């Protein structure tokens, strides 16, 4: 598992790149996969820069923090831009959660450095909502 | 919901105090409530400083980020200090997720300010592992 600030931040950046693609370039594919009829689905970003919409893991408790569950259930009950904004916020939170799970052993100053690197990247919410 | 940096940190601090109490002063009560025989359980911290062991939220998807699911399923299969340490790290992550969920509309300078405040308190993992 990623252990140094450099390893954790490269893992973060890769997952984020996958989720950014899911919510922008591939948004039609992501939207179509989140069918409200299906069982509960979540949006995962992986450090190979792949994104997927999938069931959560069957065995619990999970190794890593898990993304928001059942985002497809909400898709048709709101404006598409608002559904995408909500997915984006929860995906920002998940990415931060994963990084600080790997970073549990970092000291206070290392945690501050890790966040500063993350905070220099625009959030998925800001990109999706058009904030700068 | 909390919106300003101070509002969000007040909420964070109270939820953290709840979770810290569950993992230290109230740990035997907390441990016993995490019954491997029940359905999957999570540990919540609330803004009134109370902690709660319960089933995951009824509403799907949840309004707030949710804590780790099923921690009672792992309680008996590892060292007690290790189970508590992993509950603590997942609980630390959950606190951070909740705060930056509320802080979604903060700008980049405001987000740095919030993290610096959160980073002024020791984490649950550091207290529980005695670091």
């Amino acid at each position: 598992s990623p252990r140094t600030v450099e390893e954790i931040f490269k893992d973060y950046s890769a997952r984020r790149a996958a989720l950014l693609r899911a919510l922008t370039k591939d948004v039609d594919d992501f939207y179509s996969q989140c069918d409200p009829e299906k069982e509960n689905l979540c949006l995962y970003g992986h450090p190979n820069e792949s994104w997927e919409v999938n069931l959560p893991a069957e065995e619990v408790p999970p190794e890593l923090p898990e993304p928001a569950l059942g985002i497809n259930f909400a898709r048709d009950g709101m404006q598409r831009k608002d559904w995408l904004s909500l997915v984006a916020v929860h995906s920002d939170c998940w990415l931060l959660s994963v990084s600080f799970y790997f970073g549990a052993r970092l000291n206070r100053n290392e945690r501050k450095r890790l966040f500063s690197l993350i905070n220099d990247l625009p959030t998925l919410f800001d990109v999706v909502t058009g904030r700068k | 919901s909390p919106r300003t940096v101070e509002e969000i940190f007040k909420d964070y601090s109270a939820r953290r105090a709840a979770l810290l109490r569950a993992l230290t002063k109230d740990v035997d009560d907390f441990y016993s409530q995490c019954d491997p025989e029940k359905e999957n359980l999570c540990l919540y911290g609330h803004p009134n400083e109370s902690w709660e062991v319960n089933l995951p939220a009824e509403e799907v998807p949840p309004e707030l980020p949710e804590p780790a699911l099923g921690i009672n399923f792992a309680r008996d299969g590892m060292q007690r200090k290790d189970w508590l340490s992993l509950v603590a790290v997942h609980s630390d992550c959950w606190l951070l997720s909740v705060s930056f969920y509320f802080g979604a509309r903060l700008n980049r300078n405001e987000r740095k300010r919030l993290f610096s405040l959160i980073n002024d308190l020791p984490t649950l993992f550091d207290v529980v592992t005695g670091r």
Partner: peptide, 12 residues
């Protein structure tokens, strides 16, 4: 390392 000792199937 630090890992959960075991687990259970997600309730449903």
């Amino acid at each position: 390392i630090l890992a959960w000792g075991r687990g259970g199937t997600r309730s449903n």
